[PDB]
Amino acid sequence: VKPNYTLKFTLAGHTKAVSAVKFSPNGEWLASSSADKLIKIWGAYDGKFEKTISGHKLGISDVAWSSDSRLLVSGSDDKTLKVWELSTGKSLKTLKGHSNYVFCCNFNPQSNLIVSGSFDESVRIWDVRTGKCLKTLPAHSDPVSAVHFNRDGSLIVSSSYDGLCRIWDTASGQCLKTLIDDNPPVSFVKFSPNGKYILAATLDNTLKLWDYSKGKCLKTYTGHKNEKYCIFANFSVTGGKWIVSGSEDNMVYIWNLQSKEVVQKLQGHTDTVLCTACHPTENIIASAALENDKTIKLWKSDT
């Protein structure tokens, strides 16, 4: 059982490193964020440039979609987050309160809340309607690399360069759990679609799939290079069950979720592949890379 992603489109337009790429939940759009201070929207199936969204003062490190594909949230080195209305390009709110670069962000499923993580070592939960910060969690002792809500919004996972991965009760703000052999920086983390497992990446060229309730590592995936950058990893579940991640050898890696065999390496980028994302219904992968490449690529497979 094995995939065959082939290159279909290359999208260009960013003038600096592309920091994140993300499909709209409705499957129609691809958003990209960049150090060039911009967000760009592309048609998810044809890769056709849709529009540019501007307003951040400095580069953007992450960008994310509301549940209804109408809004987007971004986090910037200008210490703020901004909520965008897709259809109009408006900056509806500007979320202020972090004391250093905002690195990562996400809506909850209900999309009435946003979670953020920052170089200032905190995780914040914001009210989407009022733009006010509801809670500041003193989550880590080093910059916060990723944040993500589980399926029903009850839980938040964070990760940090301090080597910890932590689970938080959304309602109370309490730390319910802390994952722990060495303490290599944790560069990325994300719940599984069903909310039972946690995919985590560490700066020792390793991805691990955790059962977070039992606090035990169930799978480990290697072959890629990852010692420097906070690279996105994904579950691909529309066809075969894969793990998908970028890599510092300019290649997109695809593992079999069960066997942990590398089943495909997508070639064609000319710098570190920092971001990847999986389309929600079709077997379509998006990828994008750093300063020396700056292009976004779309790949499709029959499985």
């Binding site: 600096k16 490193a17 920091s19 994140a20 960049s34 150090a35 400095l58 580069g59 953007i60 490190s61 992450d62 910037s76 080195d77 670069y101 690195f103 170089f119 910059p143 360069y161 920086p185 700066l203 010692e227 420097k228 950058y229 906070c230 920092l274 750093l290 300063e291």
Partner: peptide
């Protein structure tokens, strides 16, 4: 360059 595009120190 935004934070994510800068390597581990």
């Amino acid at each position: 360059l935004c934070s994510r595009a800068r390597p581990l120190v």
